[PDB]
Every structure is written in C-alpha cells, then in structure tokens.
C-alpha cells in the first residue's frame, strides 16, 4: 500500500530521499497518481512551505503531506518516524496555523465542494486545465466541458473559475455572466479553498460580470 513523490527539493535533497525510500522497501515516482500516499515538501525553520501543484493534489487527494524534515530526521534516527509528528500546516500565502491536510486526511466523504459544479473556463498558466479540473474533481465538484453544458436548476450551486491575467486577447473575460448564470471566480477561489480545506465562501474573489 506504500508510495509517494517529492516537491520543492534539490538533487542532493532528492538523494537522502532516495536513500530513505530505497531503504524502507518503497516506491518513488516523479509525478502524481491516485496511488501516491505521500508528498514530501521543502520547508524552512519549521513546517511552513510553498504552493506547488503537487501540493494541492496531496490535500485534494487528502493524502499524507509530510514535510521534508520527516527524512533528514528518519535518517538522523536510523528508523522511519511518525507522519503526524512532521506534517505540513502552512505556506507563503495561506498561513502558519491552518493544518490543511488534516481535515483532508480526516474529513473524507464530507468533502468541501459538496455537490458543486465547477467550470474552469480557460485559459490558465503553470497548470494544465486537466490538472486543475482533476483537482476539483478530487475535492468533489464535477467538471463541466463548456458553460452552456451546465446542469442548472434543481439542487446544485454552479460556479465559473477563470484565471485572471492569463487571458490573451482579453476582457473576453468580462462577458461571461453575459454568457450564463453562475458565479465567476478567480483561480484563487479554488486554490485557497483546497489548501486551507475551508470551502471558502466565495464572497471575496468574484470577478465582476456584466449585466
């Protein structure tokens, strides 16, 4: 059942992690599947890190999100220690307190996009849709191909996520509530909601749409 990836880290910093994996009869892949059970992260002083794609996807997969100092210290102690000891609980934008991956690995079938419907209306950067979509897919939404393809009315709240600035020949992003009836929010909504594991009330990043 045991496997994982790395993020942030240098080559040398990769190496202790090979030695560490190679030790504990483990498996190690570059990029991330649903089988991956750990994401090992670069930090500093104590347990606060950075936003890396792999970083959300270990919360969105509500998997084990151990900080690097799990390894320089499972080596500097001849055995593998505990993961609740050395877990991430922050980043450069999202806190020092929060412990995102907690309510994540803990709060499972009650999942934060509880019957939502999400459309990642393009285009975005540093993040292929597939993987942003797959992120919300993992948080419990259900991705819509195009807007017009929504399933409106009964039950489900709808939302449109777009990356602000990454719009090429733009303001083509200001005519959207003018191309349907669902809250338009920045990639920001989505990221901040996964990481914190607080399904943000969206009242705050909601690009203004033309009546």
């Amino acid at each position: 059942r045991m496997s994982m990836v790395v993020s942030g880290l240098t080559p040398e910093e990769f190496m202790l992690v090979y030695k560490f994996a190679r030790k504990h009869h483990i498996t190690l892949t570059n990029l991330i599947t649903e089988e991956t059970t750990h994401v090992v992260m670069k930090t500093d002083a104590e347990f606060v890190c950075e936003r890396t794609l792999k970083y959300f996807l270990g919360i969105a997969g509500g998997k084990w999100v151990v900080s690097y100092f799990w390894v320089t210290q499972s080596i500097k102690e001849r055995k593998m220690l505990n993961e609740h000891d050395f877990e991430v609980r922050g980043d450069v934008v999202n806190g020092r307190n929060h412990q995102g991956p907690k309510r994540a690995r803990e709060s499972q079938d009650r999942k934060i996009f509880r019957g939502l419907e999400i459309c990642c209306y393009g285009p975005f950067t540093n993040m292929p849709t597939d993987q942003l979509e797959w992120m919300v897919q993992l948080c419990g939404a259900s991705v819509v191909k195009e807007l017009s393809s929504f399933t409106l009315g009964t039950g489900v709240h709808p939302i449109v996520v777009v990356q602000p600035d990454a719009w090429t020949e733009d303001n083509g992003f200001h005519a959207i509530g003018q191309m349907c009836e669902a809250p338009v929010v920045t990639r920001e909504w989505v990221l901040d909601s996964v990481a914190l594991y607080q399904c943000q009330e969206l009242d705050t990043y909601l690009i203004p749409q033309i009546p």
Binding site: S7, G8, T10, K42, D44, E50, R51, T52, L53, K54, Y55, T125, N126
Partner: peptide
C-alpha cells in the same frame, strides 16, 4: 509569473 512550484539556490 513569479512563478510557482520547483526551484533552487538563495531561497
């Protein structure tokens, strides 16, 4: 375009 995810030296 800062950007984010995976780098090095004077962090």
């Amino acid at each position: 375009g800062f950007g984010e995810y995976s780098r090095s030296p004077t962090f």
